[PDB]
């Protein structure tokens, strides 16, 4: 979400963090992902750091005797050193050399603090008589060739959690959909780490992660998907961005104007009101439809229209005519032109007469396509065919 | 049958190293290198080549340990030229389109690689990445210019 600055609890140029007492776990993320619990408590030995494979070939820059805290060039390399510096032959060559931030120091009769050293020592605790200033990391191992303590200045750091959030209301629809704040602070590592020479500025970040909790669906479905979004509202009197954590289901419909003869046409409404739990429980759309004529609509499957087949009739769609024969004839019969049909008389139709009744027939078209024994058919009764749709084939 | 890849796979299956790792080398390589030019000195003075035994070096050595020393000394280079492999292809490939032929290049480099691979001095510290690649380039250019044209013209 959001990234916080702070130059505080940031370190100077690398260093060890021989801190005392914040709490945050290994947590998966004793790494990045921090719920930085509790800290007044984070003290550092920001150091210089210069770690390089090459031989043992070049500079006896050194510890036991420190060398220039100041700007030498070691093994054909520098530092804006702050201190007393250590080699790492471990390799018949070496790999690494660390200026040690800080004053060198000065001793001898080594038992004294070599006896009394392993701790990072304290202001006003003296040396051996020689008072101090910060919780002085003294050298846990008094400097070699005899003569020096070590005192890389140490600065200790705090946090409890979250500085104030300004006139803000993290919010969603929030009827379980839990879109809401959380200041994710941050700190890269621990006591037992010595860092490398620039800054580990981050040891408290506040990124922000703004979670979306609950597992309900009607409102808040997409647990790993129901994702934030951000516009620029509250940009008037309080133009200062709020910052929406808004998440979504912003669906669609089609045309709403795609009116057609056969195609059930299209008329239509919303339900909206901008700014409601999607206006609660919300029946959205419409699509009202034409018919290629106004007449009896049979061949229907009570329910929706997953099929595209429904009558709409008339005395011709369900054909009808005059019988010059009597108030005569019977129900429903699938005429082929000229059978015994104005009885005595004969005429055109193919399909359902439904009756013949002032001589008012009701004599539909429905075409025999007399088939053969043997088809590899297509379709059905009542399946109001669609124009040209490829009905039964016979192999 | 990619050929380029058919070799590219495999080189993959030899794995890259680091200065320190390539330092044990350097010494060994030199340890073998110079040793031979004994072998040549003794050559040139006499019989044209020591090229007998422990006297195939004028030097003193328990003979079996000689051949051994030789092995490790040069094995370093072999376990180095190949150890690199990639990067040279990143170079040669630039001339795979320039001319010659991806494979054709590769070799050439290789040649170089060698030469560098040994003319090379871990005392100046900075990695071969700022020196091996030199020799390569060289090698190469001297190939699409040395041929790839079927009428050799003054490369100058």
UniProtKB/Swiss-Prot annotation, chain A:
Range within the parent protein: 593 to 1003 of 1355
Gene source species: Nostoc sp. (strain PCC 7120 / SAG 25.82 / UTEX 2576)
Quaternary data: In cyanobacteria the RNAP catalytic core is composed of 2 alpha, 1 beta, 1 beta', 1 gamma and 1 omega subunit. When a sigma factor is associated with the core the holoenzyme is formed, which can initiate transcription.
Protein's name according to its UniProt entry: DNA-directed RNA polymerase subunit beta'
Job of this protein: DNA-dependent RNA polymerase catalyzes the transcription of DNA into RNA using the four ribonucleoside triphosphates as substrates.
Sequence similarity: Belongs to the RNA polymerase beta' chain family. RpoC2 subfamily.
Curated annotation (Swiss-Prot), chain B:
Highest taxon of source: Bacteria
Protein name: RNA polymerase sigma factor SigA
Motif (Interaction with polymerase core subunit RpoC): 104-107
Primary role: Sigma factors are initiation factors that promote the attachment of RNA polymerase to specific initiation sites and are then released. This sigma factor is the primary sigma factor during exponential growth.
Covered range of the whole protein: 79 to 234 of 390
Region annotation Sigma-70 factor domain-2: where it falls in the sequence: 80-150
UniProt record similarity statement: Belongs to the sigma-70 factor family. RpoD/SigA subfamily.
Subunit text: Interacts transiently with the RNA polymerase catalytic core.
Top-level taxonomy: Bacteria, Bacillati, Cyanobacteriota, Cyanophyceae, Nostocales
Cellular localisation: Cytoplasm
């Amino acid at each position: 979400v959001a990234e916080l600055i702070d130059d505080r609890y940031r370190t100077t140029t690398g260093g060890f963090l021989k801190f005392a007492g914040v709490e945050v776990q290994k947590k998966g993320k004793a790494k990045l992902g921090y719920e930085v619990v509790q800290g007044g408590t984070l003290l550092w030995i920001p150091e210089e750091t210069h770690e390089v494979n090459k031989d043992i070939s070049l500079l006896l820059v050194e510890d036991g005797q420190y060398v220039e805290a100041g700007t030498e060039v070691v093994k054909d390399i520098f530092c804006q050193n702050s201190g007393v510096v250590e080699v790492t032959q471990k390799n018949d060559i070496l790999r690494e050399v660390v200026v040690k931030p800080g004053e060198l120091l000065m001793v001898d009769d080594p038992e004294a603090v070599i006896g009394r050293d392993n701790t990072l020592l304290q202001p006003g605790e003296e040396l051996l008589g020689q008072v101090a200033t910060e919780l002085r990391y003294i050298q846990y191992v008094e400097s070699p060739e005899g003569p020096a303590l070590l005192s890389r200045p140490v600065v200790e750091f705090a946090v409890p959690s979250n500085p104030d959030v300004p006139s803000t209301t993290s919010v969603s629809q929030q009827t379980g959909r839990s879109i809401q704040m959380r200041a994710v602070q941050r700190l890269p590592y621990k006591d037992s780490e010595r860092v490398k020479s620039v800054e580990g500025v981050e040891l408290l970040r506040t990124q922000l992660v703004l979670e979306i909790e609950q597992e309900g669906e009607q409102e808040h479905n997409a647990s790993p998907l129901a994702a934030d979004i951000e516009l620029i509202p509250d940009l008037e009197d309080a133009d200062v961005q709020r910052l929406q954590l808004v998440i979504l289901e912003s669906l669609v419909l089609r045309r709403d104007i795609a009116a057609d003869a056969t195609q059930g046409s299209t008329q239509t409404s919303l339900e909206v009101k901008d700014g409601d739990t999607i206006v609660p429980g919300s029946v959205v759309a419409r699509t009202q439809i034409l018919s290629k004529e106004g007449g009896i609509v049979r061949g229907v499957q009570k329910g929706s229209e997953a099929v595209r087949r429904c009558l709409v009739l008339r005395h011709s769609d369900m054909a009808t005519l005059n019988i010059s024969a009597k108030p005569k004839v019977k129900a429903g019969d699938l005429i082929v032109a000229g059978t015994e049909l104005a009885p005595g008389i004969f005429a055109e139709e193919s399909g359902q007469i439904v009756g013949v009744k002032n001589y008012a027939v009701t004599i539909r078209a429905g075409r025999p396509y007399r088939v053969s024994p043997g088809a590899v058919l297509q379709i059905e009764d009542g399946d109001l065919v669609q124009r040209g749709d490829n009905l039964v084939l016979l192999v | 049958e990619d050929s380029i890849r058919l070799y590219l796979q495999e080189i993959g299956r030899i794995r890259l190293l680091r200065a320190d790792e390539e330092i044990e080398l350097a010494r060994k390589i030199a340890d073998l290198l110079e040793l031979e030019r004994v072998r040549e000195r003794l050559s040139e003075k006499l019989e044209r080549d020591p090229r007998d035994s422990e006297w195939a070096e004028a030097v003193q050595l328990p003979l079996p340990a000689f051949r051994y020393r030789l092995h490790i000394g040069r094995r370093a280079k072999d376990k180095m030229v190949q150890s690199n492999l990639r990067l040279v292809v990143s170079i040669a490939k630039k001339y795979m389109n320039r001319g010659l032929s991806f494979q054709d290049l590769i070799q050439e480099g290789s040649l170089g690689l060698i030469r560098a691979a040994e003319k090379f001095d871990h005392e100046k510290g900075y990695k071969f990445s700022t020196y091996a690649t030199w020799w390569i380039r060289q090698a190469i250019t001297r190939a699409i210019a040395d041929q790839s044209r079927t009428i050799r013209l003054p490369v100058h």
